[PDB]
Amino acid sequence: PEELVKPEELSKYRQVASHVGLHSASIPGILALDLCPSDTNKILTGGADKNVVVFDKSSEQILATLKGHTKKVTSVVFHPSQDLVFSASPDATIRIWSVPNASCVQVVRAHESAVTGLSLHATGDYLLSSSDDQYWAFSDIQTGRVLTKVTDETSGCSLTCAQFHPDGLIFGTGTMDSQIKIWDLKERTNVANFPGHSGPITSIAFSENGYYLATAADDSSVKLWDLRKLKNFKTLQLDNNFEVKSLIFDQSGTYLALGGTDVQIYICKQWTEILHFTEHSGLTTGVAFGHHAKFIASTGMDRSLKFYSL
Ligand code: NA
Ligand code: NA
């Protein structure tokens, strides 16, 4: 892709903005981040303040402050239609919102305890969720109906994150007992399990190349899996104090970002570190790539949404 920002140019990025007014000053912190895939200048954040916010990077305006969650917001997903956004929370709900009406259109109650992960299906019509209640669920966006809800009797433990593979046939759920469980959506079956981590899985990310999966856990490692071989071919081991809270590949699969203790970006081809930011004070809760990796975005417990670019 001619437009993609290459490593030499990416390596020169610096903080270009830091916005602290998206969420409440008295209940400080942003806990979740997503960018709209059809326009990455539209930003979605979940707050410690229980609110979901849509913000325009270009105009630097809050387009909507979406209220209704009764606990902090820990997952957010931006639909490509631009007018739908999704959130989830320790209040055990998944909420579907209209941006233009600044309203909640559905409250999906698939779970009995905190919802730990949220992922939009390839079709754009369904949401996958994971929970501490040990189940995953697949829910219809338009009716809020829970279409299926499944757990592993054998594993029987809290699911800590969930992501669809980009083709929309399989997905992964991380567990509290350090497993990455791969599921076949159609058959509702657990088709493989990737062990090797220690401690709770914290984040998983599927690459757009369709064959890489990156996983992180409390063992302060990021493990890379080739789904064709079902093997862990590379592990990035950080220090044992480091918390990896968020993983994401850029849209091209060229780069992998991690965030938590701080923000780091690796080149997938050579697994070389290409950017490292330590601007946030305290935990970084989200990281994302703008279109063509033309900017990076991050969110922090320090209240800020930061953009990094030339
Ligand atoms: Na650790
Ligand atoms: Na610093």
Query: DSSP secondary structure string, the chain?
Result: -TTSPPHHHHTT-EEEEEE--SS-SSS--EEEEEEETTEEEEEEEEETTS-EEEEETTTTEEEEEE---SS---EEEE-TTSSEEEEE-TTS-EEEEETTTTEEEEEE---SS-EEEEEE-TTSSEEEEEETTSEEEEEETTT--EEEEEE-TTT---EEEEEE-TTSSEEEEEETTS-EEEEETTTTEEEEEE----S-EEEEEE-TTSSEEEEEETTSEEEEEETTTTEEEEEEE--TT--EEEEEE-TTSSEEEEEESSEEEEETTTTEEEEEE--SSS-EEEEEEPGGGS-EEEEETTS-EEEEE-
Q: Which residues pair with 106 in a beta bridge?
A: 96
Interatomic CA distance for residues 69 and 92, integer angstroms: 9
| CATH T-level fold of 1-310 | Methylamine Dehydrogenase; Chain H (2.130.10)
The residue length of the chain stands at 310
Interatomic CA distance for residues 91 and 135, integer angstroms: 16
Q: Do residues 133 and 110 touch, judged by C-beta distance below 8 A? A: no
94 Cα–ligand 2 center, Å: 34
54 Cα–ligand 2 center, Å: 26
Relative to beta strand 75-78, strand 221-226 is: unpaired
Q: How far is CA 181 from CA 100, 101, 146, 163, 189, in A?
A: 37, 38, 21, 11, 10
For the chain, the domains span 1-310
199 Cα–ligand 1 center, Å: 8
- Ligand nearest to the CA of residue 244, numbered in listed order: 1
Q: Which residues pair with 190 in a beta bridge?
A: 183
Q: Do residues 37 and 43 touch, judged by C-beta distance below 8 A? A: no
Identify the CA nearest to 57 among candidates 75, 39, 83, 73.
Answer: 39
Q: Do residues 171 and 159 touch, judged by C-beta distance below 8 A? A: no
Beta-carbon contacts of 229 under 8 Å, excluding residues fewer than 6 positions away, are: none
Q: Do residues 221 and 235 touch, judged by C-beta distance below 8 A? A: yes
Identify the CA nearest to 127 among candidates 112, 146, 152.
Answer: 146
Angle 234-238-239 (CA atoms, 0-180°, nearest 5)?
145
Structure determined via = X-ray
277 Cα–ligand 2 center, Å: 8
245 Cα–ligand 1 center, Å: 11
Interatomic CA distance for residues 145 and 124, integer angstroms: 15
Interatomic CA distance for residues 42 and 53, integer angstroms: 10
220 Cα–ligand 1 center, Å: 4
- Ligand nearest to the CA of residue 263, numbered in listed order: 2
Q: How far is CA 157 from CA 112, 116, 152, 243, 288, in A?
A: 14, 13, 8, 21, 29
Count other C-beta atoms under 10 Å from residue 267's C-beta: 17
Interatomic CA distance for residues 300 and 32, integer angstroms: 9
**121, HSE (Cβ side, Cα atoms, 13 Å):** 17
Q: Do residues 222 and 212 touch, judged by C-beta distance below 8 A? A: no
Interatomic CA distance for residues 241 and 231, integer angstroms: 26
* DSSP output for 71-111: S---EEEE-TTSSEEEEE-TTS-EEEEETTTTEEEEEE---
Count other C-beta atoms under 10 Å from residue 102's C-beta: 13
Interatomic CA distance for residues 116 and 170, integer angstroms: 18
Q: Which residues pair with 266 in a beta bridge?
A: 256, 273
217 Cα–ligand 1 center, Å: 8
* Alpha-carbon torsion (236, 241, 247, 250), positive or negative: negative
Report the amino acid identity of residue 162: A
- Ligand nearest to the CA of residue 197, numbered in listed order: 1
Identify the CA nearest to 183 among candidates 200, 204, 208, 198.
Answer: 204
Identify the CA nearest to 158 among candidates 121, 122, 201.
Answer: 201
The residue numbers preceding gaps of C to N over 2.5 A in the chain are: none
Q: Do residues 284 and 297 touch, judged by C-beta distance below 8 A? A: no
258 Cα–ligand 1 center, Å: 15
Q: Do residues 32 and 45 touch, judged by C-beta distance below 8 A? A: yes
Angle 291-294-297 (CA atoms, 0-180°, nearest 5)?
80
- Declared resolution, Å: 1.9
